[PDB]
């Protein structure tokens, strides 16, 4: 969705 994950408190690589 438009590329808003890395920014708005969302995705981030696990581990």
């Amino acid at each position, epitope marked *: 969705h438009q590329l*808003d*994950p890395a920014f708005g408190a969302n995705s981030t690589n696990p581990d």
Partner: antibody
Amino acid sequence: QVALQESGPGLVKPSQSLSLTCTVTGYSITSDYAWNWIRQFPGNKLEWMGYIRNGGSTTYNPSLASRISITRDTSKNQFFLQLNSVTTEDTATYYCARGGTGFTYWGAGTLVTVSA
Amino acid sequence: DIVLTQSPKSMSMSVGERVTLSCKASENVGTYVSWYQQKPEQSPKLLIYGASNRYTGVPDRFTGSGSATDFTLKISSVQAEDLADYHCGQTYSYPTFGGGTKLAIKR
């Protein structure tokens, strides 16, 4: 339009701390959008160092996380990068950029050299 | 930490030819992959965001497809002006860029 422009030290000694300053024109850094610091090493390689969010939160790169600090000055409309313990591997050209739907508006990019 | 991989490190191409670069994610990034263009002594310029969406002022000759892992970029006709490095990056987890594909013109 959006016009980012970084400034700051050009050449700095090792073990010292670096400190750039990105100044933006034509959009408040407090109303929507991610405000990033990206660096480009000599040649081809890009590295996203981190960002200061609209609310003023911070998400650094899990590897430079112990050495960097991205703060802002909401009244001057500028956010700043701070790289501590600069090793000679850290020399590269630095950019500040707007982030929403990818990285859209990039700054001219100021080159920083870490040499004795 | 989501590794992305660009294929032709470099390419030589005539004019009017059909270029096609490729970018790959290590672990499903969805459709959050974007292409940038970097000319000599210039800052990158967004080309495609959302894996398939073209930006503004970006000429038709640039189109992108791809989803979760496999992404590509096309140029219907390479022009002299289309000389530069082409990067890609995922904006899913932590932003990580590809290795850049340097594209040169065959004269």
